[PDB]
Amino acid sequence: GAMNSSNYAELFNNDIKLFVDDTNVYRVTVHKTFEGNVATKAINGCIFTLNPKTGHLFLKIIHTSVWAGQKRLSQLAKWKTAEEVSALVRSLPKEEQPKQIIVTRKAMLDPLEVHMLDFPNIAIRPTELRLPFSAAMSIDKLSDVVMKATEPQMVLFNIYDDWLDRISSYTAFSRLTLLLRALKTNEESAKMILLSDPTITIKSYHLWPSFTDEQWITIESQMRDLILTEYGRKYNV
Amino acid sequence: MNTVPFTSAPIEVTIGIDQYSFNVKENQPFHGIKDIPIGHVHVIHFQHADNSSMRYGYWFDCRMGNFYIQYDPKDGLYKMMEERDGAKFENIVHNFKERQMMVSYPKIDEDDTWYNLTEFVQMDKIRKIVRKDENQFSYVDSSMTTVQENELSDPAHSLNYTVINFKSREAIRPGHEMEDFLDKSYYLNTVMLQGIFKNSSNYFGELQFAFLNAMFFGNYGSSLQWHAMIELICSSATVPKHMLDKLDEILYYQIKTLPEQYSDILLNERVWNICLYSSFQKNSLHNTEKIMENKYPELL
Numbered sequence: 001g002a003m004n005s006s007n008y009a010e011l012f013n014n015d016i017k018l019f020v021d022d023t024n025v026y027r028v029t030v031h032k033t034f035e036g037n038v039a040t041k042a043i044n045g046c047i048f049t050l051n052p053k054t055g056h057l058f059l060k061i062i063h064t065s066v067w068a069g070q071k072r073l074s075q076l077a078k079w080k081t082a083e084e085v086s087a088l089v090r091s092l093p094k095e096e097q098p099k100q101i102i103v104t105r106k107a108m109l110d111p112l113e114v115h116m117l118d119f120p121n122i123a124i125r126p127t128e129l130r131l132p133f134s135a136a137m138s139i140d141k142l143s144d145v146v147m148k149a150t151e152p153q154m155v156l157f158n159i160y161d162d163w164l165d166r167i168s169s170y171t172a173f174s175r176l177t178l179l180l181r182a183l184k185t186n187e188e189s190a191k192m193i194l195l196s197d198p199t200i201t202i203k204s205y206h207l208w209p210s211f212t213d214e215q216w217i218t219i220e221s222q223m224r225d226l227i228l229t230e231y232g233r234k235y236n237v
Numbered sequence: 238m239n240t241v242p243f244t245s246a247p248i249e250v251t252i253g254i255d256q257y258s259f260n261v262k263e264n265q266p267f268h269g270i271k272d273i274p275i276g277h278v279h280v281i282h283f284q285h286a287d288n289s290s291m292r293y294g295y296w297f298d299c300r301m302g303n304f305y306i307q308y309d310p311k312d313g314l315y316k317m318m319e320e321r322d323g324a325k326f327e328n329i330v331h332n333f334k335e336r337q338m339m340v341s342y343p344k345i346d347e348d349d350t351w352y353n354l355t356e357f358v359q360m361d362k363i364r365k366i367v368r369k370d371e372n373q374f375s376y377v378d379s380s381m382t383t384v385q386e387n388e389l390s391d392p393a394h395s396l397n398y399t400v401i402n403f404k405s406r407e408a409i410r411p412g413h414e415m416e417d418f419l420d421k422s423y424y425l426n427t428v429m430l431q432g433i434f435k436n437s438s439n440y441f442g443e444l445q446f447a448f449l450n451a452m453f454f455g456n457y458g459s460s461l462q463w464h465a466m467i468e469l470i471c472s473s474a475t476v477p478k479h480m481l482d483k484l485d486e487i488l489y490y491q492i493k494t495l496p497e498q499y500s501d502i503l504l505n506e507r508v509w510n511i512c513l514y515s516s517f518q519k520n521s522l523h524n525t526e527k528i529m530e531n532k533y534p535e536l537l
């Protein structure tokens with residue numbers, strides 16, 4: 001069934017599962033042509049495939065060459081996503097394949113179902129959550145590796161850094177979704193908060209700053225405040 | 238012209254014969270139906286006055302034998318039977334006709350409706366969908382489930398329609414996932430037409446038989462099958478031109494004959510809107526699109 005606030009804790013049990021977000025697969029800038037018409041120019045994208053229990057992020061970079069000479073690219077992007085997710089699963093050892101794949105947008109269901117026909121015991125699920133995974137390209141290292149790619153490329157990151165050494169998966173996913181919700185609603189403010197302090201650094205192989213537990217509490221509070229303010233503004237409440 | 242005599246009519250029942258229907262009273266002197274056109278299959282069907290549930294009936298072809306109806310008070314239904322003795326049969330019928338105790342198959346000469354609804358329906362194909370090889374005729378009722386439905390309980394009583402499933406390995410070539418899902422022509426033309434049905438006539442025969450079972454018996458699995466076979470053609474970019482023209486004629490007469498008050502349950506909104514307005518063949522069903530618009534504009 002669909003994943004929602006009621007069955008949220010299921011993300012952190014010991015059944016392997018992956019979220020797949022396709023919101024950054026097909027990315028364009030819209031511009032005017034010499035004649036004054038509008039055209040698109042694609043830029044590199046990525047599939048965001050995340051194990052929420054472990055923090056594994058299989059970031060499949062989608063190079064602009066995959067669109068060359070193709071029509072209906074927004075439609076093709078969904079099928080390319082499903083092709084790449086199926087290929088990831090096939091590459092994985094049997095004991096490392098997911099039992100569920102949760103897609104963040106319902107339009108991924110049929111393409112993934114069709115590409116996963118060879119895996120009838122892998123459940124393809126939608127979700128009622130409004131997850132902020134689109135903001136993944138606001139994470140500097142992730143954006144940088146996508147834009148620099150010259151060919152199709154899979155890059156492997158822990159999106160939780162080593163937080164799991166001190167906190168649970170549930171808490172790590174909550175912190176991740178808060179940071180991403182913040183970056184999505186006001187990227188500039190969010191980034192100011194994370195890097196304001198020159199003494200707090202990001203390890204060479206990590207994505208986020210090396211906050212102590214107490215600094216994380218302050219950071220998380222600052223991020224919550226950012227999000228509620230923007231919300232008032234959005235609705236005049 | 239052939240005859241289906243009745244032994245008697247012990248219980249009050251509405252009897253249908255093809256698209257016609259007659260009310261018969263309990264123990265009314267009624268001994269059958271005469272003047273049935275030769276050359277087509279036919280269906281004779283029943284709805285008891287006391288149980289508007291379970292419509293049931295028999296598909297038959299009078300070229301294949303002499304058939305009659307007799308009520309069974311133990312099983313509680315009108316049963317079709319075959320009479321092997323040609324002379325015994327002629328004699329029974331002749332007597333009943335002489336006593337003018339038979340209704341006449343009420344065919345208007347101008348009317349091609351039944352031909353148009355059964356053009357490709359062949360008794361031998363019905364008998365493979367409805368498996369009961371001791372009889373030459375086939376029983377169908379409202380409740381019988383299809384094989385495909387059974388996959389998702391009694392095999393002997395199933396409708397063995399050809400299983401169509403758009404998200405299946407049979408439908409989707411490895412490496413052509415998107416292509417085959419968005420353009421079902423290889424499923425239609427290679428898998429179904431060339432492989433399973435052998436020709437478009439057998440495909441149309443099963444489509445027409447599914448519609449008629451849905452219409453006469455409210456058989457839900459039959460309706461599912463009818464719509465699936467329509468959607469497979471409409472979702473195919475490449476269809477022989479003779480098939481498209483014939484499909485338009487087939488569906489026109491099905492939509493024409495459908496009871497106006499059943500269009501709610503018998504017509505699937507998504508399939509018809511996708512077929513008439515989004516699919517590859519949105520522009521290939523002019524007659525069907527025109528009768529749907531002027532009769533069921535609500536559904537669309």
Ligand SMILES: Cc1ccccc1CC(N)=O
Nearest residue numbers: 055056057058156157158
């Ligand atoms: C992607 C990744 C991240 C952290 C640890 C291990 C991996 C490799 C894998 N999951 O196959």
